[PDB]
């Protein structure tokens, strides 16, 4: 590579690149950093401890124009695969975790075109803070998000914006979080149904304030309650229909209160098979424990 | 020892790792990428996820790594950590929920070609999806897809060490045996940018679940109960034990549920065979 | 010191087959970056076929296309031709030249062999 | 396929002196990325062919300083700065872009007398 050395060399040796500095001219303005968010799959939604466990993969794009070159000076190398820890990021977490991982898991290399484009795809195992409906359980469905936001950048230092696409050279904004169709496994218990993105400005938060800005990314998700209605309804339901056939008994059988109070004591297995699967919120009775 | 602190001396004097090892920025690293299996540790049917210790051989050649071994007391092959030369950047595509890549830095072995060994040891947790059909006789194929995150084909090349997974030091698992395991390559082009493509090897397991505990366990009392529940239309009316015994079986069936939610993968893809022989013997006690 | 030694020269009959390696030591190379070449007695160079990374399988010439088998062993650092259907007119010094490094769209020689006469005749 | 001519048929060389050979193509030889794909061969009598430069400008390893060579697109240039009695040989121009690879019919060398 004397041609990727000698880049390299120019853009960061020679130049005096600083990654601390934002890829500003001046200090009032704010750096574009565009966000988009790849589903890989969902890996489960914990009922009790309200977390939902995603794998997304976050498409990072912003310029830099310190780390533009003229290709045909230098090879035609048109990009360059750079640690991430050798040049500035716009450094985006997760704000809505629960258990301390704000980051991406993989820091993998950023993308560098000639005109300035730094492109990053990160991976990223994420735990969320997702509240739970139990209302119609097991029928029920959940609205989860995931809301990224810059502690490190506020507002008035980075602008978040949603990914651009084209489609018969008409630009749209992807609106959605993107799903592979042929990578993508459906999570055994939860169907989704719909997965918007939008970018949230708060007018009353000041713009110097990590809170004035964020994009979410929902999930509106359907529970697949096929294996509580096998499993759980159709017993439970069933036993308690049995007990009306106490009234159909003769007295002299000297049955009756047995089985009705074993059907009770049935029920109270159910319950203690229940109480297990639920976290203990008083917003709502669940819908099989009604 | 002194002569290899001087090559290494020599070799690090201007060496980057952040630019790939060829003498020409046109040329393609080839990377040979094997898979040894060690352990399956675990299949989670509810999560469905797999969950294995391997070790990931790859092998490539840094141009800028030679030596003449005459020209340091006939060394031809030192140890060198990992972290201090370019490595190729191996992602588990389809990770469920544990590293996307290697975490575990152990050293390469260099030889004076300039040829490169690393063997390091990684825990996948791989996405794997589950068919409840047949449970607990079923047979799952779960893959591991493995590619270069940042780098396409025409810049960085891989290829299967073998056709198939090394399973040499492989150790017995208590719950599966795998039939059938085999690598495969794959390249993807997209009609945006159809001079690079993009490259992944693909090894699959065919793993068929070993029955017995859940024929023990689950099966067995199951049986017993369904027998148990014809034997009330023998009993005399004027017993008054008709409903004792019905009611009994049926509150032990109430009693099993418990082992059998805890035993039973909680999903709803298909109902599993041993949930409609257990849903068969409650509707028809 | 890399160094590429191929077969021993090899005298053949017409319709018959010549299988010529090309054994490198001194350096690691690939599964891609093997061209054979062939100098026929008095004309001047031509090429075969060879594997590059772009079409990762081997590409030959419309002469031989049907013949010829190129094929590249990077476990044993090893280089094959296999020409079938000999004729009269494949009698000609077979060379393999070979990069450690393979480039993506073409190739180059830096490495050659000292290459080896095959003479068809009956 | 791409036909490469080469003139001259043959160039008599005066060890000491510079010496100049030029090859052509019917078609263009620029890749995509402005990549010229010729490259250039030396046979010595009784030894095997050896590259002296690759993609029309960029010399090999090894190769000594005198060579050199440029060109745009189908017409290629190799110049020898000093010419020494070891650069005695065929000149090969083979172009590298389309399948199949054709080399030039190749220029003969020889010491001036």
């Known amino acids: 590579l004397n041609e990727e050395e000698r880049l390299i060399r120019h853009l960061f040796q020679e130049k005096g690149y600083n990654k601390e500095l934002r890829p500003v001219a001046h200090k009032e303005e704010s750096v574009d950093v565009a966000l988009a968010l790849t589903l890989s799959n969902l890996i489960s939604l914990k009922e009790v401890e309200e977390t939902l466990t995603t794998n997304v993969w976050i498409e990072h794009g912003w310029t830099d124009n310190r780390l533009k070159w003229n290709a045909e000076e230098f090879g035609n190398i048109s990009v360059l695969r750079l640690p991430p820890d050798m040049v500035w990021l716009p450094e985006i977490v997760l704000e809505n975790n629960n258990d301390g991982s704000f980051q991406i898991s993989y820091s993998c290399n950023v993308l560098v075109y000639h005109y300035g484009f730094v492109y990053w795809l990160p991976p990223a195992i994420f735990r969320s803070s997702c509240p739970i409906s139990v209302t119609y359980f097991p029928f029920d469905w959940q609205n989860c998000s995931l809301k990224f936001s810059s502690l490190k950048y506020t507002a008035k230092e980075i602008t978040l914006s949603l990914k651009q696409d084209a489609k018969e050279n008409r630009t749209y904004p992807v609106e959605w979080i993107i799903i592979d169709p042929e990578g993508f496994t459906e999570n055994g218990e939860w169907e989704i149904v719909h997965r918007p993105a939008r970018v949230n400005v708060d007018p009353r938060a000041p713009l110097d304030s990590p809170s004035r800005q964020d994009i979410t990314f929902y999930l509106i998700i359907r529970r697949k309650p096929l294996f509580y209605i096998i499993n759980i309804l159709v017993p439970c339901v069933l036993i308690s229909f049995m007990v009306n056939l106490v009234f159909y008994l003769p007295a002299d059988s000297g049955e009756k209160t047995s089985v009705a109070i074993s059907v009770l004591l049935a029920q109270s297995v159910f319950l203690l098979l229940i109480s297990k699967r639920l976290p203990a919120t008083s917003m709502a009775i669940p819908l099989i424990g009604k | 020892s002194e002569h290899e602190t001087r090559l290494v001396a020599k070799l690090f004097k201007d060496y980057s790792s952040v630019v790939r090892p060829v003498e020409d920025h046109r040329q393609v690293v080839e990377v040979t990428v094997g898979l040894q299996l060690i352990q399956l540790i675990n299949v989670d049917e509810v999560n469905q996820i797999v969950t294995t210790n391997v070790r990931l051989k790859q092998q490539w050649v840094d141009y800028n790594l030679k030596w003449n071994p005459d020209d340091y007391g006939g060394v031809k092959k030192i140890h060198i950590p990992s972290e201090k030369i370019w490595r190729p950047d191996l992602v588990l595509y389809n990770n469920a929920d544990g590293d996307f890549a290697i975490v575990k830095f152990t050293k390469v072995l260099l030889q004076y070609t300039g040829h490169i060994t690393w063997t390091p040891p990684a825990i996948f947790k791989s996405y794997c999806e589950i068919i409840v059909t047949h449970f607990p006789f079923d047979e799952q194929n779960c893959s591991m897809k493995l590619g270069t995150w940042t780098y396409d084909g025409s810049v960085v090349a891989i290829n299967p060490e073998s056709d198939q997974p090394d399973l040499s030091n492989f150790m017995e698992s208590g719950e599966w045996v795998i039939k059938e395991s085999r690598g495969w390559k794959h390249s993807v082009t997209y009609s945006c940018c159809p001079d690079t493509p993009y490259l992944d090897i693909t090894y699959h397991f065919v793993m068929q679940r070993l029955p017995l505990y859940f024929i023990v366990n689950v099966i067995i009392p199951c049986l017993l109960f369904s027998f148990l529940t014809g034997l009330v239309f023998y009993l005399p009316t004027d017993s008054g034990e008709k409903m004792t015994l019905s009611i009994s079986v049926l509150l032990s069936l109430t009693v099993f549920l418990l082992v059998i939610v805890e035993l039973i993968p909680s999903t709803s893809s298909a109902v599993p065979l041993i949930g409609k022989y257990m849903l068969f013997t409650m509707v028809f006690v | 010191q890399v160094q590429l030694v191929q077969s021993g020269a090899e005298m053949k009959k017409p319709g018959s087959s010549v299988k010529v390696s090309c054994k490198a030591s001194?350096?690691?190379?690939?599964?891609?970056?093997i061209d054979w070449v062939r100098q026929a007695p008095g004309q001047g160079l031509e090429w075969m076929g060879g594997i590059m990374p772009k079409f990762d399988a081997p590409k030959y010439a419309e002469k031989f296309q049907g013949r010829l088998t190129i094929t590249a062993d990077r476990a044993t650092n090893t280089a094959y031709m296999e020409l079938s259907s000999l004729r009269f007119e494949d009698t000609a010094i077979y060379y393999c030249?070979?990069?450690?490094?393979?480039?993506?769209?073409?190739?180059?020689?830096?490495?050659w062999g000292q290459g080896t006469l095959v003479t068809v005749s009956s | 396929d791409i036909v490469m001519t080469q003139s001259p048929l043959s160039l008599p060389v005066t060890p000491g002196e510079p010496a100049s050979i030029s090859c052509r193509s019917n078609?263009?030889?620029?890749?995509?990325?402005?990549?010229?794909?010729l490259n250039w061969y030396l046979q010595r009598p009784g030894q095997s062919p050896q590259v002296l430069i690759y993609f029309a400008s960029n010399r090999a390893p090894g190769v000594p300083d005198r060579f050199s060579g440029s060109g745009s697109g189908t017409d290629f240039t190799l110049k020898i700065s000093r010419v020494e009695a070891e650069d005695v040989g065929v000149y090969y121009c083979?172009?590298?872009?389309?399948?199949?690879?054709?080399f030039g019919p190749g220029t003969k060398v020889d010491i001036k007398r």
């Open positions: 001194g350096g690691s190379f690939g599964s891609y970056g």
């Open positions: 078609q263009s030889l620029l890749h995509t990325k402005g990549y010229k794909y």
């Open positions: 030249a070979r990069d450690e490094q393979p480039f993506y769209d073409s190739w180059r020689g830096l490495y």
């Open positions: 083979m172009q590298g872009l389309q399948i199949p690879f054709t």
